[PDB]
Amino acid sequence: QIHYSIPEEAKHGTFVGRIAQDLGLELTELVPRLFRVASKDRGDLLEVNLQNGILFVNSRIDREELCGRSAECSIHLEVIVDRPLQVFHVEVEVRDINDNPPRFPTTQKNLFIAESRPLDTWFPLEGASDADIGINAVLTYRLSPNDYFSLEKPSNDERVKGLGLVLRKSLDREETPEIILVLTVTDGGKPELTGSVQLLITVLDANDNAPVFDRSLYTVKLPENVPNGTLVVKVNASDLDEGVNGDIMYSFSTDISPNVKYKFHIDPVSGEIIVKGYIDFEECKSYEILIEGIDKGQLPLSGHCKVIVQVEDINDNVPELEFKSLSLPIRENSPVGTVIALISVSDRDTGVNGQVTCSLTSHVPFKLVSTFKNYYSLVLDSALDRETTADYKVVVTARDGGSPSLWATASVSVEVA
Amino acid sequence: QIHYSIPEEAKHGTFVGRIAQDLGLELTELVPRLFRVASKDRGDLLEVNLQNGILFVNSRIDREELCGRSAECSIHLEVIVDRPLQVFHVEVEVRDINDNPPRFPTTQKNLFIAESRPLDTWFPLEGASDADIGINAVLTYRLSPNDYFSLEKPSNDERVKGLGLVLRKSLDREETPEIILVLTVTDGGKPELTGSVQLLITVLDANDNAPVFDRSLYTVKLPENVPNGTLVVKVNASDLDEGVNGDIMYSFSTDISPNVKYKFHIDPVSGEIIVKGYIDFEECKSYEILIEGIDKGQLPLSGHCKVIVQVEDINDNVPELEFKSLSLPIRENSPVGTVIALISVSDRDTGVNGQVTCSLTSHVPFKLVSTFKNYYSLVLDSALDRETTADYKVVVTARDGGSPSLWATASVSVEVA
Numbered sequence: 001q002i003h004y005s006i007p008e009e010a011k012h013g014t015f016v017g018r019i020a021q022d023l024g025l026e027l028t029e030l031v032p033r034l035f036r037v038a039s040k041d042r043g044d045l046l047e048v049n050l051q052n053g054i055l056f057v058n059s060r061i062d063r064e065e066l067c068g069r070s071a072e073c074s075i076h077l078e079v080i081v082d083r084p085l086q087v088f089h090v091e092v093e094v095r096d097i098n099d100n101p102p103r104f105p106t107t108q109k110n111l112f113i114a115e116s117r118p119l120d121t122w123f124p125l126e127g128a129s130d131a132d133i134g135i136n137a138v139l140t141y142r143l144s145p146n147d148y149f150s151l152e153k154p155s156n157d158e159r160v161k162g163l164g165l166v167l168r169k170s171l172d173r174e175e176t177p178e179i180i181l182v183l184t185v186t187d188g189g190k191p192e193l194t195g196s197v198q199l200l201i202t203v204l205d206a207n208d209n210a211p212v213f214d215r216s217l218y219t220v221k222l223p224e225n226v227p228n229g230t231l232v233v234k235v236n237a238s239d240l241d242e243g244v245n246g247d248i249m250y251s252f253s254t255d256i257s258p259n260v261k262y263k264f265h266i267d268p269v270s271g272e273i274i275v276k277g278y279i280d281f282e283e284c285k286s287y288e289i290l291i292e293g294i295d296k297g298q299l300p301l302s303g304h305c306k307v308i309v310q311v312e313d314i315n316d317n318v319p320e321l322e323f324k325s326l327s328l329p330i331r332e333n334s335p336v337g338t339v340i341a342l343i344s345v346s347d348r349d350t351g352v353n354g355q356v357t358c359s360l361t362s363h364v365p366f367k368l369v370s371t372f373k374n375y376y377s378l379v380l381d382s383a384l385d386r387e388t389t390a391d392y393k394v395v396v397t398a399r400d401g402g403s404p405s406l407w408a409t410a411s412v413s414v415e416v417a
Numbered sequence: 418q419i420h421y422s423i424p425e426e427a428k429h430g431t432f433v434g435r436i437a438q439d440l441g442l443e444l445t446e447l448v449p450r451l452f453r454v455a456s457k458d459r460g461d462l463l464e465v466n467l468q469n470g471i472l473f474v475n476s477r478i479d480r481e482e483l484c485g486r487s488a489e490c491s492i493h494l495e496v497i498v499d500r501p502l503q504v505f506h507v508e509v510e511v512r513d514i515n516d517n518p519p520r521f522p523t524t525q526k527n528l529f530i531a532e533s534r535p536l537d538t539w540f541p542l543e544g545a546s547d548a549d550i551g552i553n554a555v556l557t558y559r560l561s562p563n564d565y566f567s568l569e570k571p572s573n574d575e576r577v578k579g580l581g582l583v584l585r586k587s588l589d590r591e592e593t594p595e596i597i598l599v600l601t602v603t604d605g606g607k608p609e610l611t612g613s614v615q616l617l618i619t620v621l622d623a624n625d626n627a628p629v630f631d632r633s634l635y636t637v638k639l640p641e642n643v644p645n646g647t648l649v650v651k652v653n654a655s656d657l658d659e660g661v662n663g664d665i666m667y668s669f670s671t672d673i674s675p676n677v678k679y680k681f682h683i684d685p686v687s688g689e690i691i692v693k694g695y696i697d698f699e700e701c702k703s704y705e706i707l708i709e710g711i712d713k714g715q716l717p718l719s720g721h722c723k724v725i726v727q728v729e730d731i732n733d734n735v736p737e738l739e740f741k742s743l744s745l746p747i748r749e750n751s752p753v754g755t756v757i758a759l760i761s762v763s764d765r766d767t768g769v770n771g772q773v774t775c776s777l778t779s780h781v782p783f784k785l786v787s788t789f790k791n792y793y794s795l796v797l798d799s800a801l802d803r804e805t806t807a808d809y810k811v812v813v814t815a816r817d818g819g820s821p822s823l824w825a826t827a828s829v830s831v832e833v834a
């Protein structure tokens with residue numbers, strides 16, 4: 001056993017060692033004895049010049065093609081001489097040379113990371129492989145200086161495995177749709193060789209945003225007895241998420257009043273609220289409708305808006321007349337100033353639509369006077385004469401100030417005693 | 418017009434006012450003239466005693482049953498006397514009394530709020546209604562002193578509407594499944610009346626938790642050529658979410674080596690990895706398998722574990738013999754120590770499974786000697802005699818140290834010159 005040592009990938013004709021002398025042989029002895037050198041399994045990697053007895057590198061010695069991922073590598077040369085036939089053994093180690101760079105399976109990698117992913121959670125990032133063995137194979141990793149993600153180098157200790165790509169900062173798809181990272185790797189053996197990777201990460205859309213109405217409060221005015229289907233309002237809502245997490249369906253809140261839910265209808269898609277049932281100002285002066293906009297995600301989110309509608313009074317109620325008192329038949333002796341009947345007037349409407357004025361036929365001695373708001377007394381004006389006219393027919397007309405106006409009458413047969 | 422003023426719900430016989438004197442009438446004048454008092458639309462709410470000329474409360478005067486939600490309330494009494502017939506008008510206002518408490522539509526309310534709901538977002542909380550009007554109707558709200566939610570009282574200003582139930586602290590379904598709030602409301606008018614509500618809020622399950630393996634690293638040892646289907650490992654993963662967000666499907670990572678993906682199979686449900694293809698120690702010493710556990714939510718989350726398996730070498734390779742040199746035919750003159758053939762031995766296995774010893778038939782003059790590791794030279798021992806035996810048959814047996822062991826032979830016909 002005689003041991004030599006050379007680095008791989010050596011230049012053609014590299015001095016391995018004077019094999020003749022080291023085997024105790026002499027120069028004039030080499031040629032006649034047919035000094036031969038053979039390899040075990042490889043081939044013509046090493047050759048011997050007989051004139052100087054020098055063992056040298058014959059062909060390209062690629063270490064990784066021989067031992068591969070093995071730590072120890074050595075070419076075994078058997079040496080044969082004849083007359084007499086002697087056999088010697090020389091083993092020459094092949095030291096590793098850092099002539100291969102750290103390579104990744106993919107130069108660019110599309111990663112898909114969810115927006116809902118918790119912090120302090122790492123994603124399996126592929127590591128680079130190296131053909132070399134030893135310090136030349138010791139890999140050092142480096143992440144691009146970005147704020148969203150951090151890197152954690154693997155350790156030898158058990159219960160901890162995998163190249164670390166750790167979350168420490170929150171992520172939002174709407175703010176930044178894609179993040180581009182760069183992973184650089186350098187071996188430990190000099191000269192240094194590098195490897196780069198362009199990680200293209202597209203953050204997935206999570207349903208973490210609720211729909212939002214342009215106006216948080218809508219105020220519309222609606223007349224009375226407007227036909228069903230009349231466009232009350234048109235609402236618009238928006239949502240930052242995409243897909244079914246972005247599409248919005250409209251509805252009335254579950255806390256809505258039954259009468260309100262029966263008086264109005266809302267298009268789930270259009271968001272336009274229209275009149276459904278009869279609307280009376282004298283029944284309800286206004287309505288306060290809560291509107292819910294809800295997306296179509298797995299876990300639905302809801303936004304809300306308040307739509308208050310003030311009903312507007314129209315003159316649609318005919319005035320009411322009522323004789324509350326009577327003093328009939330009236331004596332002929334009755335002086336000027338006596339009261340015959342007390343009149344009461346009402347109007348269900350409001351404002352000028354409910355402001356009623358009263359009049360009467362002028363062919364009657366009696367007079368009409370306002371004693372109080374919406375109250376009249378039919379007072380005898382001028383004198384009478386029983387035999388001339390023993391009877392009268394007092395028609396009283398009540399008329400509101402609406403535009404247009406409604407009117408009602410009330411007659412009374414006034415007999416004279 | 419003569420005006421009086423009384424609080425509602427007055428005791429029977431409550432002094433409203435001396436109506437006779439205030440109308441300028443006299444006591445002895447009331448009875449003969451049939452002093453009468455009537456209401457406009459209500460009825461026998463007020464009555465007059467003629468002996469003292471006193472107007473008083475006759476029956477129960479419930480304000481809210483009269484004017485309702487109206488601000489102004491007043492009973493209109495028309496007064497009639499006869500001989501001569503005169504008509505007077507007295508209006509008596511009915512002031513509001515805080516005799517009705519703030520009432521909610523529901524004493525207890527099941528609210529359903531998502532775990533994914535953003536902060537600073539309020540949920541529509543129903544308000545209480547009150548029959549009274551004025552300061553007695555001014556409502557003050559109060560939320561139970563809880564940490565998760567806060568309350569925001571409604572304002573008169575537009576663009577701001579709805580009873581505020583504001584999120585300011587994060588919410589987690591797994592930590593606290595339900596939160597119970599208490600809403601208390603007090604009117605502004607004295608005496609104070611209250612209203613309580615038990616809000617039962619059940620936070621909905623969001624898919625915000627990734628599955629987690631009990632062990633982040635599994636290390637198993639597997640022999641060689643073990644039949645396909647052999648249980649390599651059994652992995653367990655857990656997840657805090659419920660439903661389809663909790664169920665976990667197992668698989669091999671997308672970055673797995675093709676050979677590894679073809680050599681092993683993993684049950685998506687059971688999580689048990691078994692042998693699929695042939696496994697050779699001489700081809701691959703070990704495997705590093707990344708295992709992904711992914712839930713079945715709308716936005717899937719994935720946990721990962723590393724399962725490394727070290728293959729164990731078995732003695733399944735028969736030793737190799739090789740005659741690398743020959744000096745036949747051997748001269749009879751050849752002395753003791755001459756070399757006939759050089760022998761080389763190999764074994765693809767490792768350890769004692771690859772430790773080969775050599776022997777030979779003892780009925781042969783020649784000798785076997787170790788020159789180097791796995792190398793033998795067939796050296797002539799003792800002397801010869803051409804005419805006696807002109808030929809030989811040297812059988813050499815190589816045998817590894819495995820348990821059990823494998824062996825191979827190599828014979829050579831040694832002719833003597």
Ligand SMILES: *[C@@H]1O[C@H](CO)[C@@H](O)[C@H](O)[C@H]1NC(C)=O
Nearest residue numbers: 213214234235236237238239
């Ligand atoms: C609603 O969405 C946005 C406003 O947020 C606007 O661009 C769009 O035109 C609106 N659609 C309608 C129908 O008004």
Ligand SMILES: *[C@@H]1O[C@H](CO)[C@@H](O)[C@H](O)[C@H]1NC(C)=O
Nearest residue numbers: 630631651652653654655656
């Ligand atoms: C896996 O889930 C838990 C451990 O996290 C355990 O209670 C359960 O029994 C395990 N199941 C199996 C089949 O090992």
Ligand SMILES: *[C@H]1O[C@H](CO)[C@@H](O)[C@H](O)[C@@H]1O
Nearest residue numbers: 395396397408409410411
């Ligand atoms: C009021 O008076 C008119 C005329 O007399 C009637 O036609 C009407 O029906 C109401 O009685």
Ligand SMILES: *[C@H]1O[C@H](CO)[C@@H](O)[C@H](O)[C@@H]1O
Nearest residue numbers: 392393394410411412413
């Ligand atoms: C008004 O109408 C009534 C009938 O409703 C008559 O009786 C009265 O004389 C006046 O014409």
Ligand SMILES: *[C@H]1O[C@H](CO)[C@@H](O)[C@H](O)[C@@H]1O
Nearest residue numbers: 391392393412413414415
């Ligand atoms: C008023 O009207 C009535 C209607 O019949 C008469 O009967 C009465 O005499 C007076 O003319």
Ligand SMILES: *[C@H]1O[C@H](CO)[C@@H](O)[C@H](O)[C@@H]1O
Nearest residue numbers: 812813814825826827828
């Ligand atoms: C080694 O030698 C044995 C005995 O001669 C043979 O049977 C075998 O095939 C191998 O050649």
Ligand SMILES: *[C@H]1O[C@H](CO)[C@@H](O)[C@H](O)[C@@H]1O
Nearest residue numbers: 809810811827828829830
């Ligand atoms: C071993 O076997 C060979 C044939 O393979 C013979 O030629 C030899 O003589 C020895 O018997």
Ligand SMILES: *[C@H]1O[C@H](CO)[C@@H](O)[C@H](O)[C@@H]1O
Nearest residue numbers: 808809810829830831832
């Ligand atoms: C070794 O074996 C061979 C087998 O044929 C013979 O031919 C030779 O003479 C010697 O005996």
Ligand SMILES: [Ca+2]
Nearest residue numbers: 062063064099
């Ligand atoms: Ca190389």
Ligand SMILES: [Ca+2]
Nearest residue numbers: 097098099132
């Ligand atoms: Ca190398």
Ligand SMILES: [Ca+2]
Nearest residue numbers: 100132136187
């Ligand atoms: Ca290298």
Ligand SMILES: [Ca+2]
Nearest residue numbers: 205206208241
């Ligand atoms: Ca989103």
Ligand SMILES: [Ca+2]
Nearest residue numbers: 173174208209
């Ligand atoms: Ca978002």
Ligand SMILES: [Ca+2]
Nearest residue numbers: 209241245295
């Ligand atoms: Ca959404």
Ligand SMILES: [Ca+2]
Nearest residue numbers: 280281282316
């Ligand atoms: Ca009306």
Ligand SMILES: [Ca+2]
Nearest residue numbers: 317349353400
């Ligand atoms: Ca009217």
